[PDB]
Design a protein around this nucleic acid. Sequence first.
RNA 1: UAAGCCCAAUUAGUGAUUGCCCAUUAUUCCUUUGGUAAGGGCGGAAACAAAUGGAGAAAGUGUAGCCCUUCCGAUGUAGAUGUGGCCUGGAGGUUAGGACGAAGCUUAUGGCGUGAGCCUAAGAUGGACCGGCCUCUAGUGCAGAUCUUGGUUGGCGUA
RNA 2: UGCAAGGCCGGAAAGAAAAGAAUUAGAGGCACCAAGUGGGCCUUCUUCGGUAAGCGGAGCAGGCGAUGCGGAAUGAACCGC
RNA 3: UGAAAUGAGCGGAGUAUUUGAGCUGCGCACGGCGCGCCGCACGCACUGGUUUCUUCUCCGUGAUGCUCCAUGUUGGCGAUGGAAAUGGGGUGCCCCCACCCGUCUUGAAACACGGACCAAGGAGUCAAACAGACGCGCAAGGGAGGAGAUAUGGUUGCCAGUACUUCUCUCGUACUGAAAGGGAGAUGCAAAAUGCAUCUGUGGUGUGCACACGUCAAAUCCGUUUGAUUUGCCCAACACC
Lengths: 197, 49, 68, 144, 145, 96, 128, 229
Amino acid sequence: GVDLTGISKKSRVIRHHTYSTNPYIKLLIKLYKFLAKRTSSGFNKVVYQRLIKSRSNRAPISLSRIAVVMKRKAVFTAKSKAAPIAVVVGDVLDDVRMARIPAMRVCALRFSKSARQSIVAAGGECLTFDQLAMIAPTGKNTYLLRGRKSGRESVRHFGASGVPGSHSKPYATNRGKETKRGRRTGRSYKRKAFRHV
Amino acid sequence: KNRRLRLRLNPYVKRETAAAKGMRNVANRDARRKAKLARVTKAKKAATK
Amino acid sequence: AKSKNHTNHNQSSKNHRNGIKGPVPLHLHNSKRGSWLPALVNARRVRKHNQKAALKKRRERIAAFAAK
Amino acid sequence: PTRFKKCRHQRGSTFCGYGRVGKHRKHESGRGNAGGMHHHRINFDKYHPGYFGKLGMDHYHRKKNPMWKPTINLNNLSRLIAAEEAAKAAKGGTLPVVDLQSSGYAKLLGNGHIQVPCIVKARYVSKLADKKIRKAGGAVVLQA
Amino acid sequence: SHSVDLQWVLVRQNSRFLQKRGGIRMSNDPFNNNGNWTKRHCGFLNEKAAVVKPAKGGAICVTVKDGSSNNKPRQTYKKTVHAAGVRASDVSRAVAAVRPDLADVSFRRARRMACIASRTAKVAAARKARSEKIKFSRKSARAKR
Amino acid sequence: QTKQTALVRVENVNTREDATWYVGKRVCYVYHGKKVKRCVRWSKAPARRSTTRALWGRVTRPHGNAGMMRVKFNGASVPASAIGRRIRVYLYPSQI
Amino acid sequence: VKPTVSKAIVKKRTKRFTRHRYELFPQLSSSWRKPRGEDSPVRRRYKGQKAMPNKGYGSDRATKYITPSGFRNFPINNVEDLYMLVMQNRKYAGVISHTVGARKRKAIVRKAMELDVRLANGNAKLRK
Amino acid sequence: KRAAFKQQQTESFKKAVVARKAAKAALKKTAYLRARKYSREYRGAEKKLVTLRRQAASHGNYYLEAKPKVAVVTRIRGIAKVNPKQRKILQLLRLRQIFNTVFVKMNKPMENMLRAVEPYIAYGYPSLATVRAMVYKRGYLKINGQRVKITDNQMIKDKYNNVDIVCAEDMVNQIYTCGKHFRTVTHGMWPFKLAPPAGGMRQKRRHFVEGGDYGNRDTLINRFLARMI
RNA sequence: UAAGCCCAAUUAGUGAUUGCCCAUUAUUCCUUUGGUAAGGGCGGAAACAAAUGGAGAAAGUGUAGCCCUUCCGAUGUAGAUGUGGCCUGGAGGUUAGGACGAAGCUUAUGGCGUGAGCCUAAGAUGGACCGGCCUCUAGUGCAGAUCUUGGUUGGCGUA
RNA sequence: UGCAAGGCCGGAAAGAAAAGAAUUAGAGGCACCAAGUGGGCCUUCUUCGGUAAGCGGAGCAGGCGAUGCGGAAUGAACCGC
RNA sequence: UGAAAUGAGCGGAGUAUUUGAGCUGCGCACGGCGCGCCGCACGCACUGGUUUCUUCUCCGUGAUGCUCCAUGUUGGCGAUGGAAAUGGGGUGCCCCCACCCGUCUUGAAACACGGACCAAGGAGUCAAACAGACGCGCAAGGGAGGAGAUAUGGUUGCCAGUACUUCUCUCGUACUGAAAGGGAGAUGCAAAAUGCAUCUGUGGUGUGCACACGUCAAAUCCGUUUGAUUUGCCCAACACC
Ligand SMILES: [K+]
Ligand SMILES: [K+]
Ligand SMILES: [K+]
Ligand SMILES: [Mg+2]
Ligand SMILES: [Mg+2]
Ligand SMILES: [Mg+2]
Ligand SMILES: [Mg+2]
Ligand SMILES: [Mg+2]
Ligand SMILES: [Mg+2]
Ligand SMILES: [Mg+2]
Ligand SMILES: [Mg+2]
Ligand SMILES: [Mg+2]
Ligand SMILES: [Mg+2]
Ligand SMILES: [Mg+2]
Ligand SMILES: [Mg+2]
Ligand SMILES: [Mg+2]
Ligand SMILES: [Mg+2]
Ligand SMILES: [Mg+2]
Ligand SMILES: [Mg+2]
Ligand SMILES: [Mg+2]
Ligand SMILES: [Mg+2]
Ligand SMILES: [Mg+2]
Ligand SMILES: [Mg+2]
Ligand SMILES: [Mg+2]
Ligand SMILES: [Mg+2]
Ligand SMILES: [Mg+2]
Ligand SMILES: [Mg+2]
Ligand SMILES: [Mg+2]
Ligand SMILES: [Mg+2]
Ligand SMILES: [Mg+2]
Ligand SMILES: [Mg+2]
Ligand SMILES: [Mg+2]
Ligand SMILES: [Mg+2]
Ligand SMILES: [Mg+2]
Ligand SMILES: [Mg+2]
Ligand SMILES: [Mg+2]
Ligand SMILES: [Mg+2]
Ligand SMILES: [Mg+2]
Ligand SMILES: [Mg+2]
Ligand SMILES: [Mg+2]
Ligand SMILES: [Mg+2]
Ligand SMILES: [Mg+2]
Ligand SMILES: [Mg+2]
Ligand SMILES: [Mg+2]
Ligand SMILES: [Mg+2]
Ligand SMILES: [Mg+2]
Ligand code: NA
Ligand code: NA
């Protein structure tokens, strides 16, 4: 025998196939699996990994977020160079809080109907991942983007709300209930809002 | 032990075994034993005197 | 019927299976809450000015890049 | 479907994942929320703080309809303006009129920057919302 | 509009032509040169295909789908009959004109068709000799019209 | 026990050096069955037909220091009914 | 038709894995069942007990599923099924389903002889 | 006749074949020259020490030999009933299995490590023949995480990517003389997996000086390992 | 004149440093299986009828695994999870079989699978229905619960 | 212009020499959802009560429980593995 | 059994090249005596010389094979038979192994409990509330439900299905306070107890995919790839504000 204590703890949960039943997702995975192994680009490898990911791990992105980070890169970019193609492995959703956006080329798995209308009306173009593979096979001049997930309600519930320093929402259908003892100093004690780590 | 593998890893091994054959030659071994003892003994006497 | 009262047997083995994790580095979670207030208040004034300096400095860099 | 449950995988396992020692008995903790302060206190205290006790004034015969007051921010106002009117709207000219109470809103709150100037008819308005919409070329008209 | 790649994904696990009998996946596809259930050999699925088929006598027929009338099923497949004695490489060249990736299997199938026709005549001749020495109580004769 | 290898003691072979001389020799165990079955040269030499049967093996290595020998039989293992019975140790394949 | 030649079949184990103590009870079938008893000598791997099946007994993948004749068994039910095996007739042999009747078997046997398609359970008199 | 993409491949492959043969001849010449240089270094070093010993003896003096810099350690106990301190040291020594063997520097930090796990390992000071036999017969490299037997000198050159380690004799020289690349060479090798000693041991539970096996045997470890390699 | 105790050896003051026997250990070879697996090939190279070199080559988690090369691990109660993993009654599809004999039943009927099981053969059995595959569904798998019901049974030609 | 703090701009960096002067089958951090378990027992050293116990109670660490295999004739825990 | 034999081994050449061992030069190391004298076992450098004996050394075949299978010799048996083989199955025998299952238990082969046989039956189910993982649709909006309308005012039945609709309802886009009640953008200018201006914009800082500029290292079939690093922007996140 060989002493291999805790060797199984070194292994990691790595998925190679997708759980998706979408045939067009499988076509994209087939296309970008080929590109991630026959090209040297790091963009194709990252895109291929994100196509295998679950829906929860492909958070959607707002149109205002794309335009903001595009402007942060538009400055400090030479006028000779064209703007990169924004690529997100996920959904692009419209944002009613920002009406005036520049013309951008956006590639995404799915566009909401309003988001596609807003991109086109600004002079931009909504791209498709098989179109991207033909104009940027190695991902040259692209802006890979991810949607936000820290604001999800599931994340806001994670952890115990009764321990000091915690601010997670409890699981409760009634908002008025679960507010008296343990939440106010007058009723026995209050859960401490801050704790040094 | 393999001839191919030893030569492949060590291209110089042919010269090493040729030297080994010489030291095991009876005439070479006996002549060297006589010469080595005589020259070491002469050096020992000269150093002590 | 009496049973065992207490033992620490196997506890060190249990604590080392997923190992004893090291402490968080000093540069993380270095909150100043609860520290000496007079120094805390003065540090906030400097940090507020530093943010204003950072905002202005990016404005100069953007104009300088567009200058060429 | 029954063919996907853990019961089918446990056919021949005897104990069905409940153990030989502890077994699967009827009610080993009590029924429902029993013992919230005795022998289930830690679970209640760390996961549901505030559960026990009283707080606040009573309101007999609450009617939610008199308390109806949905709010909309200034930066969400384009949700209620048609697309063709929003493009034509600009400060100093003719602006669209937004009837909040007919769209299901009672108060204009005023978070963020307004995207299209307009005339908003509202039952309530926050002091910041009224100031911001006037500086941007719009106005607030009170309705009931 | 709907490419072969998309169609193959849809029908790979469940199709009329797929036979999973005893753990073996075969195909009844009339335009399959092999009987293997693969995307390359799915003649009914590919935009262009060619299958080597037997003909009357020792002739070898090559059925070709050139991808021009795929929306008209009665015109999708065109037949060209090669005279008996055709070289197997000539049949394989005809298939390679449409599907260069089927040149090797088409050559082997062209050879097998010629072998079968020769064996069929040899087996049928031996059967006729055996029947000539047997008295049969019944003999059905299909009526002519 | 492991029946894939058998132990054979040969008369006048009482040393490990003695047993090394027999490494590789063909070993035969001779018995008889109840009926006459097929044999080598069944049709060539009809006089060979008999109930006599033979199982053939070879000496693989010596065993111990007392001339004991290890024998492996062809394919199958020697029957346990052969324990205490005569084993023939031939002089071929010859190395002399 | 002769089958394609392969390496020699090993068959790591010939004996079946039979249920513990099924010989002592007419009720129990010999079909394998994993012994889950806490004091079971079979589950505990005692020296003189029956073996339990595991992944190590798996047969060589090169010679797996190959029948002693050298072919692989493909079930067939009618004459049209024989044409799936025309090209790979040195790899597969047709097995006529048990329920197929004698009338239909005559046509299947007749056709398979002309195509040189081996039938595992076909006519014994034919093919000699 | 032939497709264009299949034609460009032929010329590229032909040039690859020519360059591969040239590299094989270049490495063979380089390994030959280095092996001759090491061979004379070893012979001269022992001849120098023989004279030094003779000179001291003739005038009633003594010669103090250099303290050995390299130790060869083999695990002689199974994996059962090991205390956590001894368990971790054997893990850091890569001695996770019985009769596993490694080369270590015989410095103070390593010596105190070896003293703590003395009942589990027999060790000593390797000879040049012992180092060569382990590298040539039992030498494996960690290539892409795989345990690959050393079958030619190109693997050694490609694995180490170092000017000073391109052949087997470079690998032996680094281990034997405790060179500046001793860690790089020894770390790049898989831990040696040796056979049990033919002829048996004496007593694995006692120290060597007690008539057992688990101590430091000094140069007697070479006789022990000669029956194992 | 130990086959006892203490000590010490390995064919013995000869000429140098492995007496011998037993493992689910070690080394090594073959096969399986699974990886935090590591790599290659996959644009059919060209040519080739039968009577008289062959076959395959799927861009792929998982199958009879797309094929080939390479390395490492493999026991396990309670327990978790996975399986183009097995089996049963029904449903939507698809494709078949049956009076030249369906279901059921019988077996020193063999073959296949590590297995759950699948399939063939025979009936000197039966007499009318039923198989495969994809999906859907559930009163879906028995050796024991002083388990339920029916039948049988040694005790016993005994008390 | 000194101390304290937060930054900015530069310089230098055997990336840690030499003196025995580390080693690693050395991918670190972060989560989520849950099961069984919550009667233990035996040994090495330490050790408390007891005359003592195959007695009761602890510390460190191995082990049995959950595990066979090769040995001590026989033995859950000893030896080897 | 040569279906790519990579060979010090096969094939071509050549009659030599260079490994040691002896003997040796100069200088330096080393040893001994105390400035340079002696010694030097023959270490380093000149890859020193010498050739006395001791060795063989020099070239050579890519896959235009993606994969699997397929090619000796000599006898015995087998010339179509109630047969010769190999495999499987059955029964006995020999030598070795080998405590009775299920269960509770620290501990079961137990003088611990349930266990005569067979057949058929026999135990994690349905509903509701919530949560997490995964699949799917839409997305700052999502979706009903009840009901109605008509294909259907039709048809034994298929059709209790399918197709269509909703100024509503509900969950969210806003949260806080016991309540009365209030209610969240950035930058700039400035310090008004509701301050002004502008609206293409991550509030700031540190760490941070890809991408873009370079810059080194290694390997290249010289087309590149594969690692590291500088700078810019930093997405998702994390930590301080
Ligand atoms: K209750
Ligand atoms: K499997
Ligand atoms: K009964
Ligand atoms: Mg939020
Ligand atoms: Mg007690
Ligand atoms: Mg307790
Ligand atoms: Mg059971
Ligand atoms: Mg279990
Ligand atoms: Mg459970
Ligand atoms: Mg419980
Ligand atoms: Mg109480
Ligand atoms: Mg009160
Ligand atoms: Mg079997
Ligand atoms: Mg137990
Ligand atoms: Mg039947
Ligand atoms: Mg011993
Ligand atoms: Mg011990
Ligand atoms: Mg393996
Ligand atoms: Mg061709
Ligand atoms: Mg697959
Ligand atoms: Mg396991
Ligand atoms: Mg039912
Ligand atoms: Mg059907
Ligand atoms: Mg019978
Ligand atoms: Mg029977
Ligand atoms: Mg079935
Ligand atoms: Mg049931
Ligand atoms: Mg039953
Ligand atoms: Mg009972
Ligand atoms: Mg009776
Ligand atoms: Mg390391
Ligand atoms: Mg207890
Ligand atoms: Mg309990
Ligand atoms: Mg030669
Ligand atoms: Mg001097
Ligand atoms: Mg062969
Ligand atoms: Mg012959
Ligand atoms: Mg016995
Ligand atoms: Mg009990
Ligand atoms: Mg008890
Ligand atoms: Mg028991
Ligand atoms: Mg008892
Ligand atoms: Mg009881
Ligand atoms: Mg509805
Ligand atoms: Mg909210
Ligand atoms: Mg309120
Ligand atoms: Na594998
Ligand atoms: Na237990």
